[PDB]
Design a protein around this ligand. Structure first.
Ligand SMILES: *[C@@H]1O[C@H](CO)[C@@H](O[C@@H]2O[C@H](CO)[C@@H](O[C@@H]3O[C@H](CO)[C@@H](O)[C@H](O)[C@H]3NC(C)=O)[C@H](O)[C@H]2NC(C)=O)[C@H](O)[C@H]1NC(C)=O
Ligand SMILES: *[C@@H]1O[C@H](CO)[C@@H](O[C@@H]2O[C@H](CO)[C@@H](O)[C@H](O)[C@H]2NC(C)=O)[C@H](O)[C@H]1NC(C)=O
Ligand SMILES: CCc1nc(CC(C)(C)C)c(CN)c(-c2ccc(C)cc2)c1CC(=O)O
Ligand SMILES: CCc1nc(CC(C)(C)C)c(CN)c(-c2ccc(C)cc2)c1CC(=O)O
Ligand SMILES: *[C@@H]1O[C@H](CO)[C@@H](O)[C@H](O)[C@H]1NC(C)=O
Ligand SMILES: *[C@@H]1O[C@H](CO)[C@@H](O)[C@H](O)[C@H]1NC(C)=O
Ligand SMILES: *[C@@H]1O[C@H](CO)[C@@H](O)[C@H](O)[C@H]1NC(C)=O
Ligand SMILES: *[C@@H]1O[C@H](CO)[C@@H](O)[C@H](O)[C@H]1NC(C)=O
Ligand SMILES: *[C@@H]1O[C@H](CO)[C@@H](O)[C@H](O)[C@H]1NC(C)=O
Ligand SMILES: *[C@@H]1O[C@H](CO)[C@@H](O)[C@H](O)[C@H]1NC(C)=O
Ligand SMILES: *[C@@H]1O[C@H](CO)[C@@H](O)[C@H](O)[C@H]1NC(C)=O
Ligand SMILES: *[C@@H]1O[C@H](CO)[C@@H](O)[C@H](O)[C@H]1NC(C)=O
Lengths: 726, 727, 74
């Protein structure tokens, strides 16, 4: 038997996880059953901590919970209503975590946007109607920090649509000081930001469709503006409104449109801020000390470090974050070296030049932990594979003596790692993501030895024994003296003397990686296991984790090299002799939707057919922060010419050679239906037949249980027919 | 050799020729030739060139349409045509003088003018601009502002709001001149509490943010626009003072709740008839209103009121029918359902309560086309007992039993569908013939009744078409409970009853619909029948029109029931007929038809393999109030909510697992909103049924754009071909 | 009246006057200046300037301004 569509859609063969949240440097929590238990590692044992049926009589079903770092209060989250990718709305209730009695008075209000404990003690910070509130005790009246909060126009301590999606990847824009004395926050001003407007059809009982109006800056439009503040949570009278000390952006930033792109505390009294110019090739970091006598914040002009880029933009998606030594007089941050590669720099607060603590033809992925002895980080060095993740440990006292940690713990099963550290890194967890079944293991960083297996996924392993699973290749091809990596999802009982159809699974967007060592049970698994379709993905120009030379390649030049490199990919695959040339398809979601569209638009005649889900159609339609990073401004004096040369509409005439499926959710707040509306219109006008599917009230995820089920069924029907599959 | 292909249909290969004339006097009409516009003498035809097409080019715009003043002195010129809804649009206007030689330059008609009309004699103008009414006594003089209240999307003076345009007046105009252009009567519509349908218009790829279009549109049960009525006196317009308009208020029984103004007809120089309709559309009232000098006001005497009601259904076919006053205005004729339920001509006296019927029978009068003093002229489907035929009749007024069929016999093989254009006092008439053969336009005298000349016999079209293998049309009936129900079939050429043909059921099936008729058409079906060998059939079952009230009011308060079942029963009778492949029977429709199709596909009947729904209604709460409520009453617990509730297509989603479905809809459909199809797709996704969708960006209800018209038919053609396993 | 202080940004090529370097001069008893606001005399480094302004007794005296501080000293 094979891994069917219903198997993927009903999640029969489930990957097991080990999610743990460290309350301390010793103990973590795990939902094992329905209820929460406290685990250790010092003698190794564990005990039952609390039940989801200690709050059975609560009345509601809790969406999430939160522990107050001191361990005295639990914060229960229910009435969850989703907004965008991260933003949402909930009701919150607090318990005296000891007595497990509900805190009855001064309750946190319904319709709260964000809530967060101080890193120590049990202070609260919440956002409600775009305003910031603070609760020193979970049973005392809140202290109202901001008063400017206005729906859709002024966000205090939460992000607007674009800062949520592209800049912070979070709703909240609040940052407590290490020891909970100071609360920093951003305030976003959407006043002149244009609204995207779209209909929401709602339940069928809704007679007249609603119009949703999100302030959303499309490429070139009036962006939001941002101010930054710090407030002292201790000294906080009720007799007088709380005064909030502003920190303005540096001069070189105030001179034109800009973004606040990083917030990192250093000590109780030191905060660091990274600002980005709207043209995202220049970025500045301010370090700001508190003044005990002023009550104010001073960022020294000489202390300003600058992150520049003349080959492309800055960062991978945003400038990298700093990690501060305990004294706060020094920090490490991942940056690009003189020849492309992204490595860790040791900055001395009181000067300009870092020195690189790493070098070579491989990028560092992220800094995971810092002690005053070593520095822990993830990279793709092992076996010079960019699609692999391994955990490394570098000695601060000697930068040349770098010991690996994960790489060889299990080489065959495990080439892709992530790590969750304890509260001071006395222990750490390893998520192995593949290419074998995910493996979760608890280690001690004391003597770097392994403690125990947390999840070896043998349960899933056992019921995958009588399934004919797809296999997976992961290898490079050389193009113009460059290693370009691809992956293949090969059908079981693969026979390279046979000719298999192929689906090119494309994302291809800036700094992407579709060819990795990650193990996945997805739609491609069904396609190979059942339909005997090879599913392949190729990391061409503009993909990530290979240096600035490959990644910046598409700078100001989207819809070119990454599009062209996807076609060349197929040519290479087919010319490996196991591919039916006559049956090659292409598909992608979001950016990949755009690339698929572009390829089917290119007229190369490699591709028989293709699917594009929520594609971009022309870059002016997508949002400023993302689009402008790689494209610039759509003005005649910048890149308006190329914005025009990259629209899918302009290639409508070419879709006559291909069978095409275009799918889009009508309530897609991210990639707007508009984009697909313009593709279809463009196609109609040249007289090309294609398939279409809108999804009423689905967003960019098309993630409703029933919609998800439907879109994959539909696409399966499409691909099979295109492929003459019975 | 060859057949009627898709490109044929789509590229308009075999054109159909019309003869679009405009009467101007009693003996003369206008036609266009080399683009040159000529006047013809009906008696002789010694036709001279009226206005050669070289006069308007250096003038430098696009002459979309034109209009002569009735006295013949001035030509109105329409340009910058920008469409609103079905009828409503906006344009710039220049006036051209024949006598003074050149065009007018001073006090010019505004850009963005909503509507323009001449007085019925002379050369007065009345126009609406920015929802307000203006009058030009002389094309060159300043205009007198009649109304100061008009506010965009809210107060509509002399033009209709969305619903009144589509549903009541089938016009953008709410202006009616008195016969000799002395009085200007108008309606004012208020949409203050009318909710707005809102939808994205996407425009050119150059528009960065989609525009939200917003339109006052009462859905079933929603707050309706209100209506007031006025008459102004144009001869007594003062420059020094604001012109006063006299309000005629609706009768007591109408103000007692929501209502509509449905009809406006001037009777005489100083007499107007107004028909009002209750919101529950089974009770309507006609007011005859006379001017009174010594008061200045208008009086509609209670004793001259005329109630027109229905207990089986609604009043009228779609609206109460219009009066036809005798020259002296003391009497009128109108089509009303009789005691048998058949629509016939009733003769009414202003100063009396009962009418007397002057036609009767098991058939219906379609329209009163002319009324002289010797003859009533009317179109009916009496001939041969074919409800799908239309012929011309004259009633000898002096003895209404003496009736003559003017068109029946002229050419009974070629011609059984007719319409008529009468000259101003009916001295002459154009007869248009629309089927079953090729269209035929003929010009006639009323005195002798002799045919004068063939204006257009489509021989040009006949020439090419005898090389093409064309489908026949069979028009017949089947008997269901000793009731005849008619169908038509577009039969592939060389049709063989030994063979089993795939069948496509072409469905409208709205109230008072008629899909089975004698009209000749060149459509998508002509292609399916000729090229693909699909039998396409249509069937007029219960709810359908021109066959009496018993059949038409059968769906009263019960939409999405009998008209749906009768479509299913049709196909059954069509299989049972012996020349139909059971395994290949599809169904498709547009508007109401799209609703029926969807309702049939979800039926569980299992008769139908696959179906196509274009811009369907999904549930009746989504459609406009005056159409829907005519048939459904209000969606309330007190009226007809349960049935609104049972008659949605969404509640049948589960059953779509049984058919192959294609659901198509334009996004800028202001009529049946894209909403309706959004809710269908969503209901289908929710029960895990696979269907096919196609949205059309910025298209409206007609999906009428050149390229979008071609696209949708090509798309449908592929769906049908696959469903029927055609290569 | 408002004194803007504008710097040439090298990478830009453009000129920029930061709002925090804006200096306001106004009068409640009449017009600002003798016939126009007074001209600034900058110290060599550009960071400071002297200016004749009316003092709180309506007497025109030399005030010492810092580019960043709103308030001067006479
Ligand atoms: C978010 O940004 C908005 C600008 O996009 C800010 O709104 C501006 O603030 C000004 C002061 O409140 C407005 O009015 C000015 O008021 C002064 C008072 O003395 C008058 O002299 C000015 O003539 C007057 N300006 C005008 C043109 O009326 C601005 O008009 C106003 N701009 C807007 C709303 O578009 C918001 O205050 C800001 N919010 C926060 C808290 O940062
Ligand atoms: C259009 O209709 C509205 C009612 O929907 C009328 O507005 C009312 O005006 C009267 C004044 O006599 C007020 O008492 C009401 O409060 C108003 N209603 C609302 C909610 O606006 C208005 O009179 C109508 N306009 C015209 C031209 O007749
Ligand atoms: C991890 C998924 C993701 N995350 C992000 C946000 C970060 C880049 C910060 C991570 C973005 C940027 N909006 C996208 C994205 C969306 C649309 C397009 C045209 C391009 C990129 C995606 C892809 C997706 O939503 O499917
Ligand atoms: C002849 C065209 C037409 N004219 C009219 C207007 C009158 C009935 C007054 C004549 C209407 C009524 N809105 C419709 C119609 C539209 C939608 C629906 C659900 C039902 C009926 C159509 C059908 C169409 O638009 O194709
Ligand atoms: C929130 O929900 C409802 C208000 O409709 C009410 O029963 C309850 O008191 C509210 N609770 C809080 C925490 O304010
Ligand atoms: C705080 O500020 C707001 C408006 O700025 C004001 O209305 C309110 O009274 C103030 N509250 C206190 C306690 O001063
Ligand atoms: C209408 O439009 C044209 C072109 O903009 C212009 O010549 C004319 O003066 C405008 N207005 C009037 C009053 O017709
Ligand atoms: C007529 O009425 C309008 C609006 O009521 C008023 O403003 C105006 O004074 C009058 N028009 C003239 C010019 O007499
Ligand atoms: C038009 O009709 C009105 C009202 O009957 C009357 O005053 C006038 O005589 C008529 N004018 C002409 C020219 O017929
Ligand atoms: C008989 O009456 C009608 C005739 O119009 C027919 O369509 C229907 O099937 C029958 N009715 C019932 C309920 O038997
Ligand atoms: C960033 O990009 C621009 C546009 O290509 C380029 O001219 C320059 O290198 C950078 N601009 C600035 C102001 O730093
Ligand atoms: C400037 O003058 C105006 C008008 O005389 C007056 O309202 C105001 O007092 C003055 N403003 C200032 C800033 O003194």
């Amino acid at each position: 038997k094979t891994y069917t569509l219903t198997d993927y859609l009903k999640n029969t063969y489930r990957l097991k996880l080990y999610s743990l949240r460290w309350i301390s440097d010793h103990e973590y929590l795990y939902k094992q059953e329905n209820n929460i238990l406290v685990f250790n590692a010092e003698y190794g044992n564990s005990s039952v901590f609390l039940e989801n049926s200690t709050f059975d009589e609560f009345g509601h079903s809790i969406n999430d919970y939160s522990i107050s770092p001191d361990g005295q209060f639990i914060l229960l989250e229910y009435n969850y209503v989703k907004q965008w990718r991260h933003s949402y709305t909930a009701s919150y209730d607090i318990y005296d975590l000891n007595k497990r009695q509900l805190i009855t008075e001064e309750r946190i209000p319904n319709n709260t946007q964000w809530v967060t404990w101080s890193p120590v003690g049990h202070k609260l910070a919440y956002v409600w109607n775009n305003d910031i509130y603070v609760k020193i005790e979970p049973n005392l009246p809140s202290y109202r920090i901001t008063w400017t909060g206005k729906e859709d126009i002024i966000y205090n301590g939460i992000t607007d649509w674009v800062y949520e999606e592209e800049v912070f990847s979070a709703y909240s824009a609040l940052w407590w000081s290490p020891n909970g004395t100071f609360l920093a926050y951003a305030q976003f001003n959407d006043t002149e930001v244009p609204l995207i407007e779209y209909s929401f059809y709602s339940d069928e009982s809704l007679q007249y469709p609603k119009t949703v109006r999100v302030p959303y800056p499309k490429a070139g439009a009036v962006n939001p503006t941002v101010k930054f503040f710090v407030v002292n949570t201790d000294s906080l009278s009720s007799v007088t409104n709380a005064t909030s000390i502003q920190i303005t952006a540096p001069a070189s930033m105030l001179i034109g449109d800009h973004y606040l792109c990083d917030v990192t505390w250093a000590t109780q009294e030191r905060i660091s801020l990274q600002w980005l110019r709207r043209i995202q090739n220049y970025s500045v970091m301010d370090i700001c000390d508190y003044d005990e006598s002023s009550g104010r914040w001073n960022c020294l002009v000489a202390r300003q470090h600058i992150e520049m880029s003349t080959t492309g933009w800055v960062g991978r998606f945003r400038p990298s974050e700093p990690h501060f030594t305990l004294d706060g007089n020094s920090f490490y941050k991942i940056i690009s070296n003189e020849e492309g590669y992204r490595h860790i720099c040791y900055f001395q607060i009181d000067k300009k030049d870092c020195t690189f603590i790493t070098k070579g033809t491989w990028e560092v992925i992220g800094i995971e932990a810092l002690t005053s002895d070593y520095l822990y980080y993830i990279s793709n060095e092992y076996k010079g594979m960019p699609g692999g993740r391994n955990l490394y440990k570098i000695q601060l006292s000697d930068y040349t003596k770098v010991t690996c940690l994960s790489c060889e713990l299990n080489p065959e099963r495990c080439q892709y790692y992530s790590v969750s550290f304890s509260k001071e890194a006395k222990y750490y967890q390893l998520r192995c993501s593949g290419p074998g079944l995910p493996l979760y293991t608890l280690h001690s960083s004391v003597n770097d030895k392994g403690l125990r297996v947390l999840e070896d996924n043998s349960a899933l392993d056992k019921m995958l024994q009588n399934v004919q699973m797809p296999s997976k290749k992961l290898d490079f091809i050389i193009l113009n003296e460059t290693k370009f990596w691809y992956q293949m999802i090969l059908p079981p009982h693969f026979d390279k003397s046979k000719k298999y159809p192929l689906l090119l699974d494309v994302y291809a967007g800036p700094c992407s990686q579709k060819a990795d060592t990650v193990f996945r049970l997805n739609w491609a698994t069904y396609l190979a296991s059942t339909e005997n379709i090879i599913v392949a993905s190729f990391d061409g120009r503009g993909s990530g984790y290979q240096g600035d030379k490959i990644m910046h390649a598409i700078n100001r030049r989207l819809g070119t090299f990454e599009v062209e490199d996807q076609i060349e990919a197929a040519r290479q695959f087919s010319k490996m002799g196991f591919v039916d040339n006559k049956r090659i398809a292409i598909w992608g979601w979001s950016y990949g939707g755009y690339v698929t569209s572009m390829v089917l638009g290119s007229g190369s005649g490699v591709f028989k057919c293709g699917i594009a889900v929520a594609p971009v159609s022309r870059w002016e339609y997508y949002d400023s922060v993302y689009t402008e990073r790689y494209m610039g401004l759509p003005t005649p004096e910048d890149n308006l010419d190329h914005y025009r040369n990259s629209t899918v509409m302009s290639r409508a005439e070419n879709f006559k050679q291909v069978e095409y499926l275009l799918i889009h959710g009508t309530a897609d707040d991210n990639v707007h239906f508009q984009q697909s509306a313009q593709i279809s219109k463009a196609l109609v006008d040249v007289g090309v037949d294609f398939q279409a599917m809108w999804y009423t009230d689905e967003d960019h995820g098309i993630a409703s249980s029933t919609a998800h089920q439907h879109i994959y069924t539909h696409m399966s029907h499409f691909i099979k027919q295109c492929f003459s599959l019975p």
